[model samples]
Target: QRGSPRAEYEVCRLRCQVAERGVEQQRKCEQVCEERLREREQGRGEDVD
Candidate 1:
């Protein structure tokens, strides 16, 4: 789905997101990834904002 420019752009975008995520939002995204993984692992579900 991506070529060189697209991949380079994505790397730069994610670099900025990592740099700029608030401590709280970084925590929130971590929580979300973990929550989703756990839910999928356990065959449960939750809606997260």
Candidate 2:
């Protein structure tokens, strides 16, 4: 089953909150989440095209 993108981001953010301590690490985690979301979007675009 597929989750909504908002839920995915929320899960990522919650994990980051639990796993990361420093500001830099939190930023990196968020960046990684964004990259993952973007990659999924790109993959869907490619599949459609």
Candidate 3:
């Protein structure tokens, strides 16, 4: 029964970590998009082709 609680706690902790990472990733993506938009407006955008 002790292991059960530990397992559950680990699972919940992992879920929280996943959520945190996801939020961070979204923030990074938004920042990148805004930067790209600004660059495009300034005509200094990059070409990845």
- The top-ranked prediction according to lDDT is 2
List RMSD in Å for every model shown: 10.0, 3.4, 16.6
Q: Residues 1-49, candidate 2, lDDT per residue (tens digit)?
A: 5677768887878887897777888888778888998878767753432
Show where candidate 1 strays beyond 4 Å.
1-19, 44-49
Report the C-alpha lDDT of model 1 over 1-49, residue by residue, as the tens digit: 3235334545544654678667665666555555655555566346231
lDDT of each residue in 11-35, candidate 3, tens digit only? 5546556666677665664555556
Please give the clash total of every predicted structure, in order. Answer: 0, 0, 0
Ranking the candidates on lDDT from highest down gives 2, 3, 1
lDDT of 2: 0.78
Lowest lDDT block of 10, candidate 3: 1-10
TM-score of each: 0.44, 0.64, 0.42
**Global fold similarity of model 2 (TM-score):** 0.64
TM-score of 1: 0.44
Residue pairs with colliding backbones in model 1 are none
